[PDB]
Amino acid sequence: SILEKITSSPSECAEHITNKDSCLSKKIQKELTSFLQKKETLGCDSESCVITHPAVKAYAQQKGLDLSKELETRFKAPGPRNNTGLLTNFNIDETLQRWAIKYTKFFNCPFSMMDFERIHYKFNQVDMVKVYKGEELQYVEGKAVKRPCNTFGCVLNTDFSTGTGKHWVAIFVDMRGDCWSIEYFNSAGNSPPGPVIRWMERVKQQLLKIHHTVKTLAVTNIRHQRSQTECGPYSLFYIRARLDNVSYTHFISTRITDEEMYKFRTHLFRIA
Amino acid sequence: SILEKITSSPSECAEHITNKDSCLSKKIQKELTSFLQKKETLGCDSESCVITHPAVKAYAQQKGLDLSKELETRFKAPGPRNNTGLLTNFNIDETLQRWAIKYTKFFNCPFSIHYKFNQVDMVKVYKGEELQYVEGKAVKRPCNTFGCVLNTKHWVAIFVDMRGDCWSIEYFNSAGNSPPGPVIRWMERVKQQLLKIHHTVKTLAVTNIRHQRSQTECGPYSLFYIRARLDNVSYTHFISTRITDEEMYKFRTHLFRIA
């Protein structure tokens, strides 16, 4: 249901790719037409599996084709697409970097300030006002970028606060509407840790310098997740749904199942 | 001020065009390189003047070059760019249609004694169910902004902001005059519709300041408010600080080409 709301699809091509049918460049389509049409005999059922096959890698090295750039620029990030394996910081960082291509007013948090309570004591911190004004460095594709952003997104691990282990939660700052909101989404329904509260409060004072209505909000009313594996997909789906203008009130009043989030893995990662 | 904040510029190329050296497509740019370099010998200093010069129109009349398609699709609309001539509904309709090309989530008011646009459903506009023509193609797309410039400072601006967490329905009058009864009725009807899909919807009249002291700039003022709201300038800036008619004289150079 709600998976139909957002603008993603199970295709493994990059979201900004208009072709949609084939993810490969038209040159790479030509040079590898022999391998692509016998992909089943290579043990493959996708273009990403073909250009990662060792025989295709050798043929590409012969002809001077950069297959690694094809995977980074025209395909979605690699990750547990068809299994329930836990998301890593690399799966999340490389996914948010790709969404920043399509959503050009979206600020994806860097890799260092991703999953750490130490963000209050890190040497260089993010300034949400400088984010809004376009004066903060973000990394879109593999390139540094400064641009005005009215949305901010980050996924962090709450394992620093005592718990069973890795648990991803999402943080989203919506500066598009007349009332800006700093949002904390926990699929399990647990309140934010103290350090998260201080960070949300600090961002509110900053944003109150350039806007009149700023709310801090803990989206922890419903325990959506009953599995032990989908907190990663839950956190990424919240950011994507908010980017596609699904209100946070939907995550407050209506439950989102682990089945829907397991299917969301096919929207996140390529077949690799 | 706010004019430096918005994304427009005095260039006569279309907003959705990414080329900055020239408005012309790189194919027309090559075949007209002889006429383009002798601009002054033709009496021109702009590209729109060149591809409309009868000598250039006759050269491109030999090969299969459609200078009319370049003029309509690659340049801003013709209008009073350098004078204080009053804006027509044609100048306003053509400008709003062009902005819908760059702002893909913007629904422009369809232009078609007394008329009224009560035929619109804002919920259908938000969900992508209202037909609109963008770049000459009939499409349906989810729009979170709605803009209209209507006549009652007779030109006024209506802007609906459905981005983010709290939505607003806005009426702008650069002379500082309150909206009439029928406008208030429309704004209250649209608020009732939007309250079915959103929790907070605010209705607002932006009439604090009499911005316009001249007799000519009600048109540019209305288009400027919509463009500023599209580029995320809060309505509060039009309430707290005055925008002079001199800035609207400069904004005319952002709106139209020479023709």
Curated annotation (Swiss-Prot), chain B:
One of its GO terms (cellular component) is virion component. Substrate binds at residue 212. Disulfide bonds: none annotated. Keywords: Host cytoplasm, Host-virus interaction, Hydrolase, Inhibition of host innate immune response by virus, Late protein, Protease, Thiol protease, Viral immunoevasion, Virion. Gene3D superfamilies: Adenoviral Proteinase, Chain A. It is found in: Host cytoplasm; Virion. It comes from the Viruses. Cysteine protease that plays several role during infection including processing of the structural polyprotein or inhibition of the host immune response. Catalyzes the maturation of the pp220 and pp62 polyprotein precursors into core-shell proteins. Plays a role in the disruption of host pyroptosis via specific cleavage of gasdermin D/GSDMD. In addition, strongly decreases the host cGAS-STING signaling by targeting IKBKE via its enzymatic activity. Also impairs host FOXJ1-mediated antiviral effect via degradation of FOXJ1. GO terms for biological process: proteolysis; symbiont-mediated suppression of host innate immune response; viral protein processing. GO terms for molecular function: cysteine-type endopeptidase activity. This is SUMO-1 cysteine protease S273R. InterPro entries: Papain-like_cys_pep_sf, Peptidase_C48_C, VPRT. It comes from African swine fever virus (isolate Pig/Kenya/KEN-50/1950) (ASFV). Its EC number is 3.4.22.-. It is an enzyme of class 3 (hydrolase). Induction: Expressed in the late phase of the viral replicative cycle. Belongs to the peptidase C63 family.
